[PDB]
Design an enzyme around this catalytic site. Structure first.
Site, PDB file in Angstrom:
ATOM      1  N   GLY A   7     -35.235 -21.260 -47.289  1.00  0.00           N
ATOM      2  CA  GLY A   7     -34.563 -21.993 -48.364  1.00  0.00           C
ATOM      3  C   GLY A   7     -35.306 -21.967 -49.690  1.00  0.00           C
ATOM      4  O   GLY A   7     -34.690 -21.873 -50.730  1.00  0.00           O
ATOM      5  N   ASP A  37     -34.412 -18.898 -51.589  1.00  0.00           N
ATOM      6  CA  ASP A  37     -33.036 -19.065 -52.160  1.00  0.00           C
ATOM      7  C   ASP A  37     -33.114 -19.905 -53.458  1.00  0.00           C
ATOM      8  O   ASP A  37     -32.442 -19.633 -54.471  1.00  0.00           O
ATOM      9  CB  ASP A  37     -32.081 -19.728 -51.143  1.00  0.00           C
ATOM     10  CG  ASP A  37     -32.040 -19.000 -49.776  1.00  0.00           C
ATOM     11  OD1 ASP A  37     -31.159 -18.139 -49.554  1.00  0.00           O
ATOM     12  OD2 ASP A  37     -32.885 -19.297 -48.902  1.00  0.00           O
ATOM     13  N   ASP A  78     -27.712 -17.048 -46.207  1.00  0.00           N
ATOM     14  CA  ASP A  78     -26.367 -17.185 -46.801  1.00  0.00           C
ATOM     15  C   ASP A  78     -26.290 -18.195 -47.958  1.00  0.00           C
ATOM     16  O   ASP A  78     -25.223 -18.477 -48.444  1.00  0.00           O
ATOM     17  CB  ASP A  78     -25.353 -17.504 -45.701  1.00  0.00           C
ATOM     18  CG  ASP A  78     -25.713 -18.758 -44.916  1.00  0.00           C
ATOM     19  OD1 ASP A  78     -26.571 -19.538 -45.408  1.00  0.00           O
ATOM     20  OD2 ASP A  78     -25.132 -18.947 -43.815  1.00  0.00           O
TER      21      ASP A  78
END
Ligand SMILES: [Cl-]
Ligand SMILES: [Cl-]
Ligand SMILES: [Cl-]
Ligand SMILES: [Cl-]
Ligand SMILES: [Cl-]
Ligand SMILES: [Cl-]
Ligand SMILES: [Cl-]
Ligand SMILES: [Cl-]
Ligand SMILES: [Cl-]
Ligand SMILES: [Cl-]
Lengths: 261, 272, 260, 261, 260, 272
Positions: free
Chosen positions: B131, B134, B162
């Site tokens: 994360g 991201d 994703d």
């Protein structure tokens, strides 16, 4: 061991570790020059591997003294020196079909959802650059070199180099200079530019590292890894917003895997 | 000592927001006992925070850092299990629709950083895992400490990333062989490689030196016309996603209003 | 001095076979880009595009530096006295001026002959819009690049924000450069990949730029110019669309004598 | 006469006039239901015709009482009721491959540069709509009807209807209502909406008109006609500026034809 | 009255199974779109999108007409008293307001349940932005449509110029409507394809709209909602990209019980 | 009788330009003895004309019609032969580069109509053949007389239309089966089918009645705010070529300056 589904004139395919296939260009007497059967066998090979649940990663290397001298110019002459069709327009339609077919030889590597690693020693010339820039990861030996030769032969490269090379490294001044001059780019500069992720002292050590990498990728969830390649490819070609949308639609099914629980 | 304003606009469980000079906001991931693991409130509070910053007329730049030993350990796997181990819906199709909504909402946590027209600077020390990548790939500028590392951990957990890494990482650095290797192997990339690859712009000997440099950069950006800087971010993002001809067209349509500012008049009369 | 090329702000010479050398020529004013310049670049590169004899171009700057960027006197005339009554009408007027100024560097990109920038000393503001529209960039050890526009109170609208992020990999760096207007010196320009070679001084740099232009001109111009067209197309399109385009492009270009 | 290169279980291919091929769906006992061999033979057939210099236009019709009842639901069950793969993620990859393959059955019509004319009588249901919306020109008999059936069967249409139907007619309110309700659209409404260019009293008259059209197209420069289809297809999918650029690059060779002088 | 749905400007009812009926509800002011409306539409359709029980939506207007469009009193507040010092700062403020107003009709399109517009009497300005964001359009014989924005001194920015050209074929007609602000009556709306059916009066029209919503709700919602998602994707992308997307979409959706 | 201004900005061989009320310019194809066949000067003069109209602050709408018996017979095949029968360049590749330049330049003849932000209305009577269809499909609105016909003649001559018909015709009407049939057969489409298909907006009994209606439409458009009408054309063209989400973004960036006009203030205060 020889992979049983795979019998080719121009390629040698082996199981290199569990879940790993090793595809070796296999015309060492002709410096792995790319003749007509090569273009057809690559397509056959890749498409098979894409449907092979047992395969999780691929390494591509060259037998003999160099990765590849590029296109068989004997065979390339047959297509261009004796082109089918009456006038220029009909020759054009004929040549377009030929270019499109040869492009498919490297498209099948990209379309294969298993990661493909190029392990390059010695020369990687012309068609060789079109090949390796369609692979996901590039390694090389210290003696390796890369050359966008097409301009010397009398054409803009049309089987993938001009489409993929500019997207795999950052320095476009360098990309442009290689494409316009056909100069050889040696191993340390290939590393400096990011064309390769790593350089090794020799072919043997390079191949061991490429197989170690492929083994490491094979240890992961195949659903995860192959979903990752699909989504990286998608992201290269679309905006961030479109690619975010696509991954949400992709993973809405893929998150329902046993590999996750 | 930092004191809140008399009417604080930022009060979060998972985040601490402070003002670090004129025009600079410092957003700190603040669950250091849990190594800033991104739990359910984090995904919500980031959206609430950055949307407020987007609309904050006084803020001109943002620094994002992490409290404690590391930037972030990534997703809180306890809470991620609740969503994936108990998914709502009868059959597979109905579960899909449900997961798609969750993925989209989590993507918004980092989309808000990008949509914020103020430059956002990631200041990473220690691990920046899953994360965290991201997050930082959605920031405009990345700095790190010597001890920092970046890890696209998702494949180890059993999914393709994703919530933004696979969409932004390949657009923020040049070396795609490296991007692919990191994504497929979930290996750790240390500070020196992160600099060589261009994922970070600068590396500093420690978190304190890094953090000071990031604030000073934010202050330098905050010294320029906010019209010009905000217009610059908008147009850089648009250029990333569009052809050069489309992006030239867009910037002409954008600047036809933005050139009508005293900021320009004053800047030209000053240098004249 | 090349036949068909006379300009107030530019000097065009053609010593080496097939090679044109375009020199920014207001050393007196650090090659600041005044109104004449914006027009004459268009005239010049459109001529170059139609010159079957030219195969490659080098662009450099006369005097102490490549360019100081836009001439702020002339930019004031356009922005301090804008034509039109209300805001919306001023906007339409400004949009047209922006689009015209973009054409100054567009023409470099539309020219299918490779264009090599040879930068020494400062390359500031409008100069970055210029060199990021060139195919290849060389510089001297004294060179520096500066995305100066935010310091003047605008987002760069001539080309830099559209091309700079596409010519190098490190976006963290591009963003920092654009938001801060800080100078990037030669060593950093080399390491980021903005330039592909650095040379000790202007003279050696210029020599190398021209020797590169010679090497390009030694190739089939059909092949080289087809390479530039397809590299530019590939920058702006997906791989699948660009593969389609190159096939449709080469189906004629393969029928050349330079190939047989 | 039977076309010699063309031998199929599910299709009948004849020379209908010089330069014209007539491809007839040929399972009239099963209302031309689309079974597995159909999906594979269409690809084989089209790709052949695309490389056939003698062929200048194609007509597609159906043997028997109706154009097509659509997918063979016996065979569609085999793929969906017994899907290969362990968990949902692996079933997903399997089903995606299937969808993509079936899409190719109609893509090959579009990729064929010879114009393809659909001549529809009676029902054109489900897969039939995916077929005819991939053809360039549509004619029908007065008794014809079109039905986007997939929603009734329990799925969004995925082999081309939702991608092409909205691009071949103007009225999107109508497009949406047909797709969401699966209602039959009869011949006069097919004409009113522009889904077909013309309606004829019966199958015999319809087929004569479609062949007359194909003969008229066959009388033109094949370079011109096939360049026109290529460029119309391109224009559907790209901006006007991109399509103008593409046609300039296309015709720079094609204007060098003997058919022009 | 549906549970979870209370609004100042809207009335939401759910007589037929799986069907929601959204009614513009300021008959007093010809359903002119005031500020509350812009917000409540977003709230309403976002709720609808998350309602597993709803399969289809009908939107109609209370009173004598569908809608008179934007409430010009409230639109003045935003445009006659704009926040910000100089022009550039006013622009950023206006851009945000435009984007917010666009969201009012975006939410209709994002709602994966089909939305059917049932228009009687005038559908003016903001009303065309609304109905062109719906999937299907029905009208009464007294209906008319009017792209009123140019008469108010602006290009339509809420949705009409983006969706109207994509929902009908005749662009000559779309352009004439947009440039002249002229009324298009029911017979012309039918013949151009803007509406797919015309009915004698409001009552019969409304009945048909609801019977259509019933027919939709009688289908698998997985199939129907997947159909809407893919039709919208196909409008905005090439055929090849849309074929790719539907394959990636249905690979999960085919694993439904409504199919087995 | 029409008289020129005291300093006429429009003086062409192949075109006649007149002013037909306030704000309306009437551009007439004017080689009636040659049935308005498009020769070399025509391709040049159209570019010169429409670029001037684009920059003409007083013009708000344009009508394009043809002098004599018909709108146009299309390309002058004499002059088209010069370019194609004597092409410059040694081999095939070099000839290609030369032809590409010619095609691109001829495309500009009609691109200028589209780039002109004033609405352009085609008023067609009699034949509108080949080049004429490339012309009118680049206009915003099309009217015709009862005697009009449209013919994508290029395939009959031995080429695919490359100056705009194949790029714009399929975007201006809905029925693609019809578009394809017209393009592949070069058949004539008469006025009644042109109306049914939506290629024309209106059909009139004769050229005089048509022409009056087209001028009256131009005058009606000329009565509206020029900011609003010109912004409307710009945004309609942008919407044709972009997704709805991109086009919504674009119109917000466009109108953020264009809403700042007294045209809006006056229009709202009037209706209030
Ligand atoms: Cl690197
Ligand atoms: Cl770097
Ligand atoms: Cl400017
Ligand atoms: Cl580099
Ligand atoms: Cl050349
Ligand atoms: Cl029709
Ligand atoms: Cl508004
Ligand atoms: Cl209709
Ligand atoms: Cl659902
Ligand atoms: Cl119509």
């Amino acid at each position: 061991s020889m992979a049983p589904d795979h019998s080719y004139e121009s390629l040698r395919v082996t199981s290199a570790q569990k879940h790993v296939l090793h595809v070796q260009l296999n015309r060492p007497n002709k410096r792995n020059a790319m003749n007509k059967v090569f273009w057809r066998e690559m397509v056959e090979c890749f498409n098979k591997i894409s449907r092979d649940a047992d395969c999780r990663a691929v390494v591509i290397s060259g037998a003999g003294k160099m990765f590849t001298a590029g296109i068989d110019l004997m065979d390339m002459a047959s297509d261009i020196l004796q082109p089918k069709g009456d006038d220029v327009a009909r020759i054009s339609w004929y040549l377009r079909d030929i270019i499109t077919r040869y492009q498919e030889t490297f498209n099948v590597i990209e379309r294969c959802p298993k990661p493909v690693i190029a392990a390059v020693h010695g020369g990687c010339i012309g068609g060789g650059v079109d090949l390796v820039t369609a692979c996901d990861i590039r390694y090389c030996a210290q003696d390796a070199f890369f050359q966008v030769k097409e301009v010397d032969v009398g054409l803009a490269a049309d089987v993938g180099t001009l489409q993929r090379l500019p997207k795999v490294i950052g320095n476009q001044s360098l990309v442009n200079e290689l494409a316009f001059t056909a100069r050889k780019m040696m191993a340390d500069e290939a590393l400096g530019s990011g064309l390769v992720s790593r350089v090794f002292p020799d072919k043997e050590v390079m191949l061991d590292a490429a197989l170690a990498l492929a083994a490491e990728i094979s240890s992961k969830s195949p659903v995860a890894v192959q979903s990752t390649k699909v989504n990286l490819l998608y992201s290269r070609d679309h905006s961030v917003a479109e690619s975010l949308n696509y991954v949400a639609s992709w993973n809405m099914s893929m998150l329902q895997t046993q590999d996750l629980v």
